[PDB]
Write a protein that holds these residues in place. Sequence first.
Motif, PDB file in Angstrom:
ATOM      1  N   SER A 184       0.783  -1.245   0.000  1.00  0.00           N
ATOM      2  CA  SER A 184       0.000   0.000   0.000  1.00  0.00           C
ATOM      3  C   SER A 184       0.823   1.309   0.000  1.00  0.00           C
ATOM      4  O   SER A 184       0.258   2.415  -0.083  1.00  0.00           O
ATOM      5  CB  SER A 184      -0.963   0.016   1.171  1.00  0.00           C
ATOM      6  OG  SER A 184      -0.261  -0.136   2.366  1.00  0.00           O
ATOM      7  N   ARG A 185       2.135   1.187   0.124  1.00  0.00           N
ATOM      8  CA  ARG A 185       3.043   2.334   0.209  1.00  0.00           C
ATOM      9  C   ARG A 185       3.147   2.962  -1.172  1.00  0.00           C
ATOM     10  O   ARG A 185       3.133   4.190  -1.310  1.00  0.00           O
ATOM     11  CB  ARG A 185       4.403   1.912   0.791  1.00  0.00           C
ATOM     12  CG  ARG A 185       5.564   2.867   0.526  1.00  0.00           C
ATOM     13  CD  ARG A 185       5.795   3.936   1.599  1.00  0.00           C
ATOM     14  NE  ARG A 185       7.135   4.522   1.425  1.00  0.00           N
ATOM     15  CZ  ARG A 185       7.412   5.616   0.705  1.00  0.00           C
ATOM     16  NH1 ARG A 185       6.421   6.281   0.083  1.00  0.00           N
ATOM     17  NH2 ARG A 185       8.689   6.055   0.611  1.00  0.00           N
ATOM     18  N   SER A 217       1.635   7.739   1.421  1.00  0.00           N
ATOM     19  CA  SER A 217       1.695   6.695   0.429  1.00  0.00           C
ATOM     20  C   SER A 217       1.098   7.135  -0.899  1.00  0.00           C
ATOM     21  O   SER A 217       0.310   8.101  -0.976  1.00  0.00           O
ATOM     22  CB  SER A 217       1.028   5.422   0.939  1.00  0.00           C
ATOM     23  OG  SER A 217      -0.368   5.445   0.691  1.00  0.00           O
ATOM     24  N   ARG A 218       1.512   6.413  -1.936  1.00  0.00           N
ATOM     25  CA  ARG A 218       1.049   6.615  -3.292  1.00  0.00           C
ATOM     26  C   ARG A 218       0.091   5.509  -3.670  1.00  0.00           C
ATOM     27  O   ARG A 218       0.048   4.449  -3.048  1.00  0.00           O
ATOM     28  CB  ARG A 218       2.224   6.619  -4.276  1.00  0.00           C
ATOM     29  CG  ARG A 218       3.402   7.510  -3.886  1.00  0.00           C
ATOM     30  CD  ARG A 218       3.113   9.006  -4.096  1.00  0.00           C
ATOM     31  NE  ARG A 218       2.673   9.303  -5.465  1.00  0.00           N
ATOM     32  CZ  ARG A 218       3.479   9.560  -6.496  1.00  0.00           C
ATOM     33  NH1 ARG A 218       4.806   9.574  -6.348  1.00  0.00           N
ATOM     34  NH2 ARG A 218       2.951   9.795  -7.696  1.00  0.00           N
ATOM     35  N   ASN A 219      -0.682   5.779  -4.705  1.00  0.00           N
ATOM     36  CA  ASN A 219      -1.602   4.833  -5.273  1.00  0.00           C
ATOM     37  C   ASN A 219      -1.241   4.716  -6.763  1.00  0.00           C
ATOM     38  O   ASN A 219      -2.086   4.882  -7.641  1.00  0.00           O
ATOM     39  CB  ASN A 219      -3.026   5.334  -5.021  1.00  0.00           C
ATOM     40  CG  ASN A 219      -4.111   4.407  -5.584  1.00  0.00           C
ATOM     41  OD1 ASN A 219      -3.847   3.281  -6.014  1.00  0.00           O
ATOM     42  ND2 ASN A 219      -5.350   4.906  -5.599  1.00  0.00           N
ATOM     43  N   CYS A 229      -1.350   0.919  -4.109  1.00  0.00           N
ATOM     44  CA  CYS A 229      -2.811   0.894  -3.975  1.00  0.00           C
ATOM     45  C   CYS A 229      -3.235   1.741  -2.788  1.00  0.00           C
ATOM     46  O   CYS A 229      -2.404   2.064  -1.943  1.00  0.00           O
ATOM     47  CB  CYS A 229      -3.327  -0.546  -3.815  1.00  0.00           C
ATOM     48  SG  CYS A 229      -2.721  -1.419  -2.302  1.00  0.00           S
ATOM     49  N   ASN A 230      -4.515   2.131  -2.741  1.00  0.00           N
ATOM     50  CA  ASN A 230      -5.005   2.908  -1.600  1.00  0.00           C
ATOM     51  C   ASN A 230      -5.784   2.072  -0.595  1.00  0.00           C
ATOM     52  O   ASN A 230      -6.802   1.468  -0.939  1.00  0.00           O
ATOM     53  CB  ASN A 230      -5.887   4.095  -2.040  1.00  0.00           C
ATOM     54  CG  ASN A 230      -6.320   4.948  -0.860  1.00  0.00           C
ATOM     55  OD1 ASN A 230      -7.513   5.084  -0.590  1.00  0.00           O
ATOM     56  ND2 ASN A 230      -5.336   5.479  -0.104  1.00  0.00           N
TER      57      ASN A 230
HETATM   58 NA    NA Z   1      -1.107   3.706  -0.852  1.00  0.00          NA
END
Ligand code: NA
Length: 129
Positions: A60-61, A72-74, A64-65
């Motif tokens: 999730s880092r 974090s990034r998605n 993905c959200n």
């Molecule tokens: Na994320």
Amino acid sequence: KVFGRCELAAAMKRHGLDNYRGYSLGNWVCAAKFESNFNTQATNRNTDGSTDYGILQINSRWWCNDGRTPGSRNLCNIPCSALLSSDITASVNCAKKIVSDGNGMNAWVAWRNRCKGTDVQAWIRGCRL
Ligand code: NA
Ligand SMILES: [Pt+2]
Ligand SMILES: [Pt+2]
Ligand SMILES: [Pt+2]
Ligand SMILES: [Pt+2]
Ligand SMILES: [Pt+2]
């Protein structure tokens, strides 16, 4: 869904993983065996607060959200829960982007430590593809 070995291999090919970026299908199956034991619902929390989700334990880092991973990034533009479905399209599509990000399948720690350099063909032997 807990996939059968040959059952996942079938579905991985269908979704374009066989020789994706040069990674034969045996590599993707071995990575899934060791990341999740072939279970689309597997989750594992990391010490850093991020969580790994699905058959290939996408994190999730970056990818993905999940709404609880600070800073974090998605990058795959999905909710992490999409990675837990019995349809693996989302997991596969997000893996294509991961494996292209430049460290190839080394981005899967269980793959570097347990599949890399091994007889990966065994994981597909006996299956129909
Ligand atoms: Na994320
Ligand atoms: Pt696909
Ligand atoms: Pt190979
Ligand atoms: Pt988040
Ligand atoms: Pt499918
Ligand atoms: Pt089989």
